[PDB]
């Protein structure tokens, strides 16, 4: 599968999975396991939202093409064959970014990397629903991270200090 292999335009109704798909593309070489589950979350969320409008069914079909392609590429990778190994992989990576961004936050260092790490950590917790229900701790870290990210971002956007 090509780097940045294009899907058809994203249906307006799937606007809520836009950033999960972007995260997938950004990890397509760095970490195909993350890229795979990010797409899986987007597929599975898309189906629940609208799987009968034609545009959406087209989009979903193309997305499954990339999933199937990537499952092929990954083969006997344990993070794919064993869900819980995939879950631990994503969870450890989400926590890594969260602890990174949190450390920056506590030091008063506010910048694009710490903002993106907060928001990606929350996107990864979304993705972790494909392994089962979120824990109370997942839910709190997700909310916390989304808040810091959009808040710090909007401050800096408007020349204010958070």
């Amino acid at each position: 599968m090509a780097a940045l292999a294009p899907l058809p335009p994203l249906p307006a109704q799937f606007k809520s999975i836009q950033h999960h798909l972007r995260t997938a593309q950004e990890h397509d070489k760095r970490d195909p396991v993350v890229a795979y589950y990010c797409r899986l979350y987007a597929m599975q969320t898309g189906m629940k939202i609208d799987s009968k409008t034609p545009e959406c069914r087209k989009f979903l079909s193309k997305l499954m093409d990339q999933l199937e392609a990537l499952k092929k590429q990954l083969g006997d990778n344990e993070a794919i064959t064993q869900e819980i190994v995939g879950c631990a992989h994503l969870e450890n990576y989400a926590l890594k970014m969260f602890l990174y961004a949190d450390n920056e936050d506590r030091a008063g260092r506010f910048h694009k990397n710490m903002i993106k790490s907060f928001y990606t950590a929350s996107l990864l917790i979304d993705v972790i629903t494909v392994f089962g229900e979120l824990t109370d701790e997942n839910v709190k870290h997700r909310k916390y991270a989304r808040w810091k990210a959009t808040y710090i971002h909007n401050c800096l956007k408007n020349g204010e200090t958070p």
Binding site: M43, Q44, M47, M64
Partner: peptide, 13 residues
């Protein structure tokens, strides 16, 4: 539903 089955096959079940 063609989709639903590809998903089930994707997730090895």
């Amino acid at each position: 539903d063609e989709l639903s089955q590809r998903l089930a096959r994707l997730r090895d079940q």
